Every structure is written in C-alpha cells, then in structure tokens.
Amino acid sequence: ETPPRFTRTPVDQTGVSGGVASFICQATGDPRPKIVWNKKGKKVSNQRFEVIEFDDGSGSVLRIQPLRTPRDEAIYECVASNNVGEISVSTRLTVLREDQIPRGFPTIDMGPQLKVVERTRTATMLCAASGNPDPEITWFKDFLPVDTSNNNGRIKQLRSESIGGTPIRGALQIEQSEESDQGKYECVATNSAGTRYSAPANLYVRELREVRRVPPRFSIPPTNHEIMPGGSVNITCVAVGSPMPYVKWMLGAEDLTPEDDMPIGRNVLELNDVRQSANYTCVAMSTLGVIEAIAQITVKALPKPPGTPVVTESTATSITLTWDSGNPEPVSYYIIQHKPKNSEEPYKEIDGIATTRYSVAGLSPYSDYEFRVVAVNNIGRGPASEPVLTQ
Amino acid sequence: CKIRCLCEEKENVLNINCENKGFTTVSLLQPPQYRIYQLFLNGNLLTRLYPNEFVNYSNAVTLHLGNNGLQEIRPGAFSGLKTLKRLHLNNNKLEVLREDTFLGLESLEYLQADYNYISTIEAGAFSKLNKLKVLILNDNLLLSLPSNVFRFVLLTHLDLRGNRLKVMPFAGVLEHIGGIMEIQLEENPWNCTCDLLPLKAWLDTITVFVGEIVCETPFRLHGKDVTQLTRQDLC
Ligand SMILES: *[C@@H]1O[C@H](CO)[C@@H](O)[C@H](O)[C@H]1NC(C)=O
Ligand SMILES: *[C@@H]1O[C@H](CO)[C@@H](O)[C@H](O)[C@H]1NC(C)=O
Ligand SMILES: *[C@@H]1O[C@H](CO)[C@@H](O)[C@H](O)[C@H]1NC(C)=O
Ligand SMILES: *[C@@H]1O[C@H](CO)[C@@H](O)[C@H](O)[C@H]1NC(C)=O
C-alpha cells in the first residue's frame, strides 16, 4: 500500500461573471484515492458547481458555471484520500464583472463550430483568441480537459505561431475520429490576467461514406443485324457505371459521333440506306477505363437462280431430280415447280425439299413434263431455274 | 427495455439497442418516461410510420431508423418526440418529403436521410425546424430543390453528394445558404454551361468551402473541376 500523491494540482483562476471556471485535480496511490472538493472544510454542494470524474478514476474536475461574483470568490480545496493516507491542496477563485474587465483580458474572436466528420476522417476544431499578453489556448471536452501532452498521439494541438495584429489561432486536431470523439467541445484562453471560455461546439460522427466507383459496363451491348440493301436500321448501345460513361460510335478508326456532341450512357446509331456489310464499334469511356463492343451489320442477298436440275431416275409415275443450289450462301430449302409441257397454266408447286434431290411422284404414264427449281433462305424466294424437259 | 431489447447504461445517458429485432411496430415496448435516452431501431421491417405512432418518447435525444425499408411517413407521425435532437432515416425507400412530415419537432438539430430515393422535396418541409443545423441527403434522386426550402433555417452542414443535380440557382435556394461552414456536392451530374454560372460565382463569395465539383456535362468540360474553371470557359 502507498499513500496518495498528486499528479495534477489545481491552479488559481480569475474568471469573468456569467462565464465558466474549472479546477482540475488528479492523484495516484495504492489503493486508488478518492477526491473531494471542499470550501472552508465543508464539502461543496451547489446547483452551479458540478464535479466530473475522469473515466480512469484518477481525478475530478470541479466546474462552476455560470460564475457569480462575489458569490463564487473563494478558496477551495481538493482532498485525495485512501485508508493509507490523506492529502489536500488549496486554490483560489476570483470572478470579475464585465464592467471591471481589464484591457488585455482574453477575448474569443472566433470559436469552434458544430462539425460533422465521417468515422476515420480527421476533425479539426478551431479557435481564435486574443488578449494582452497573448494567451495560451487549452481545450475541454464534455467538461474534462483534452489531453494533448503526448505530441505523438491521435489528438494534436497546433500553433499559430506568432500573432499579432489579429488573434492567436488554436487548433484541436482529431485524427482517425471515432464515436467516442463525439461530444461537446469548448476552447479556453488563459493568461496571467485570467481565463475565458468559448461557446460550446458539438462534434458529430457520421458513418463513413464510400464513393462507389464502378468501371463502365455495357448495359445494352449492341446486337448484330442482317438486312436487305438500303435498308435502314437503328442499333442501340448502352453503358453504365460511376462516373457515368460517354458513348460514341466508330467505323473502324473513324469516329461517327462528332466529338463535341456526344451523349452520356446511351447512344443509338441510326443507319440509313445500307449498301455493304460493316463491323461497327461502340466505345464507352469513363475516367475509369474504356470498353468497346462491335455490331455486325450484314447485307444478305436473297438466292440466285439454282443450277439446272438433272433427271437421274425416271419411272412411269415418278421423276427424281438432282440439282445444285446455284448459290454461294446457305439455301434454307427448295421448291420444285412442275406441269405438263403443252399446258398453259400456273406451275404446280412442291414445297419444303430441304435437300438438292427429290422424287416427284404421282405423274401419268407416258407423259411429258417440264420442271423448275426455286431457292429459298431467310430473306426471300430466289428466282426459278432454267427448266428441264423430260418424260 | 431488457426483454426484447438490449440496454447499456452509458456514462451520461441511457443507450437502448432494439436494433435488428424485426419489430414491425413500436407499440410493443414501453420506453422510459422521465429518463433521457437514445433509441436504436435499425434493421426492423416496418413499411410505414403511422400518425402519432411516436408519442411517449417525450425525452429521446437520438433515434435511428436505418435499414427499415420505410416507404412513407403519414402526416405528423413524430407527434410526441418533443425533445428529439438527432434523427436518422438512412437506407430506406422514401421518395417525397411532405411539408408536414416533420410535424412534432422543435428541438431537432440533426437530420440524416441518405440513400432513400427522394425525388422531390416540398418547399415547406424543413420549415418550423429552427434548431436544425445539419441536413444530410446524399445518394438520392434529387433533380431539383424547391426554392425557399432553406429560407427559415440556417444550417451549417449540408450534404447533397451523389444526387441527380445538374444545376443550382441563386434565387431562392442559394441566397439562404452562405452561412454554411461545410457543403458537399461531390458526385452530381453537373452540366457546365453558362446556365451553371450562378453556383460558380456563389462559390467564390462563400468561405470555408472544401470539395470538388466536376463537370459531368459536356464532353469538352468532362472531369474539369468547376472551381478551377473560368466564366469564359463556360460561355
Ligand atoms: C429509327 O429511329 C427513328 C427515331 O424515331 C425512327 O423515326 C425510325 O423509323 C427508326 N428506324 C428503324 C428502322 O427503327
Ligand atoms: C466483321 O468482323 C468479323 C469478326 O468479328 C469478321 O470475320 C468479318 O469478316 C468482318 N466483316 C466486315 C464486313 O467487316
Ligand atoms: C402512450 O402512453 C399512453 C399512456 O396512457 C397510452 O395511452 C398510449 O397508448 C401510448 N402510446 C404508445 C404508442 O405507446
Ligand atoms: C445542359 O445545358 C444545356 C444548356 O444549358 C442544355 O441545352 C442541355 O440540354 C443540358 N443537358 C442536360 C443533360 O441537362
């Protein structure tokens, strides 16, 4: 066991009526000491005097607000005790009227302001104070003094350095803010003439907002088209992301979209009187990259006339026909035309012959006939073939 | 307090944590009546708030209503929140701020309503909220701001980031601002034409300003920070 020992003793204060005065006291020992505040050996008890303990339990701050004069003018004592011992220290409070405030007494020219900081961001409370002599600035939070002794810590106080024709600047800098940093801050200016408090300023801690950046993405990638010669078509391109991406159309190297008139997030290319096939690139760009996607325009030509049919197998009531497609492009299917030779009527048609061979059945015996071949794909019905005569 | 909710006696006030308990209504729990406290109600599925639903929370300092999927606040819901100071409404589904929505409060100085899908605020919404000093509305759907919204308050912090703002006029909206310490306009679709000049000008007259305002429109001015820009670059 060890008796109590002060690590922080209170100092005489001269404050201004209506204002605040605070006395700070801290002690150590084993067991941990308690602290009481007295006046003339009787424990203080007054609506305007509040005692606020340190969370660690080491000390207490006696705060008086609003100051009254001569009421509050007095000697007060901090007494630290345990079962091993007791120690006390005296201190004086003086309170001046505003009409007897001296020239030079510190003034608060500008005080800390309501501030909202995102968690983990830096918050700076500010104070501008002046006086004669030029005063020192200290800080209280939720009625307890701010500790910034450790220059090497999260909360730092900054210099001015030398003012001057204006007031002295004090800064309270709180890096890596957390919920516990939230609270009511006051800046305090002190010189040999006395002590003055700022108005209070609250600090709020808002949850960190993370700028959602998203690289561009083809929301509606252009889809390929095939059409007949001239020939119009509207191909649409859509990009998304943060920031929103500009969308231009290109024909290989050339830009189609004029530069100074270039839409955001959506560009529909209007193509008119299409002549030949074309690869068409669509480029979306943000500050976070450049992406491109092609659109396959093609011009399909409905079938050429098929290559003349040939008679491979002929029976009394059937005639087998083998031909060539007569086409470069895939022929989806073939339609065979048939009628009598001296007949002067529309050709009878057999449909859906998916191959280049087919046996026309049902014919009369010893009867002549004239045959033709008509090609079909997706686009349209190609012209017939040069006819074959047979029996 | 304790049965369907967790209460931590904080050093100064009382912390009541009814977070994420899937309450659809505030009918069930009896708050304390004479003790000052904070109430966390995040992660509770209530579609709507009903008129005078809150009445017995005379003394509640802060109230959190985030991640609740809120859709509407029927006229004058916060009827009894006499001494409320801080309010959160984040991450819900609110599209309109009716003028009579915040009927109850006289004492509130903080309002957070981020991520909420608000397309159109009404003018008289924040009227009769004198004490309000902080307004947070980022990541919403604000295309335009009804004039004289801020004429009756003098807030110091206004967050309008991540909204859908292209222009901001001096007449009405802006002349009331200027008393602010901080303002945020960071992630907005700013269309930098001569029609965006007032804002620009107002940004020189305003003091203690920090943040970037990059031109979304047009392509020529893409990325350029308006503050760096000039009146001739704009005309
Ligand atoms: C392309 O879009 C324009 C714009 O309305 C329209 O007038 C035209 O008919 C469209 N053409 C096609 C082939 O879709
Ligand atoms: C278009 O591009 C494809 C490859 O994606 C290529 O095979 C084709 O020959 C090109 N055609 C034209 C007309 O550019
Ligand atoms: C509030 O308390 C009063 C007291 O009688 C009661 O009648 C009323 O139903 C309560 N309302 C709510 C929402 O708790
Ligand atoms: C940008 O402003 C110009 C003129 O100020 C206007 O013509 C144009 O439509 C605007 N663009 C957008 C996307 O608001």
Walkthrough of the structure:
Chain B: Residues 139-187 are annotated as: Required for interaction with PTPRD. The complex is a heterodimer of chains A (391) and B (235). Helices cover 0% and strands 55% of the residues of chain A. Chain A has 391 residues and is mostly beta strands. The relative contact order of chain A is 0.10. Chain B has one domain (1-235): Ribonuclease Inhibitor (Leucine-rich repeat, LRR (right-handed beta-alpha superhelix), Alpha-Beta Horseshoe), CATH 3.80.10. A nine-stranded mixed sheet of chain B has the order 1-2-3-5-7-9-11-12-13, with no helix packed on it. In chain B, strand 14, helix 2 (197-205) and strand 15 (215-217) form a beta-alpha-beta unit. Chain B is elongated and about 65 Å long. The chains are: A mainly beta (391), B mainly beta (235). Chain A binds chain B through residues 55, 113-116, 142, 204, 206, 209, 211, 242-244, 246, 259-260, 262, 264, 287, and chain B through 11-12, 86, 110, 112, 114, 133-134, 136, 138-139, 156-157, 161, 181-182, 186-187, 189, 214, 216-220, 222-223. One 2-acetamido-2-deoxy-beta-D-glucopyranose (NAG) is lined by residues 27, 55-56 of chain B.
CATH architecture classification name of chain B: Alpha-Beta Horseshoe
Q: Give the count of helical stretches of chain B.
A: 3
Radius of gyration of chain B: 20 Å
Distance between the termini of chain A: 132 Å
CATH homologous superfamily descriptor of the largest domain in chain A:
Immunoglobulins
**Strand composition percent of chain B:** 15-25%
Biggest pleated sheet of chain A: 6 strands, mixed
The protein's oligomeric status is heterodimer
Topology of chain B as a string of helices (H) and strands (E): EEEEEEEEEEEEHEEHEH
The tally of domains of chain B stands at 1
C-alpha Rg of chain A, in Å?
A: 48 Å
Tell how many strands the DSSP assignment of chain B holds. 15
Q: What general outline of chain A do the C-alpha atoms trace?
A: rod-shaped
Structural class of chain B: mainly beta
Bound molecules: 2-acetamido-2-deoxy-beta-D-glucopyranose
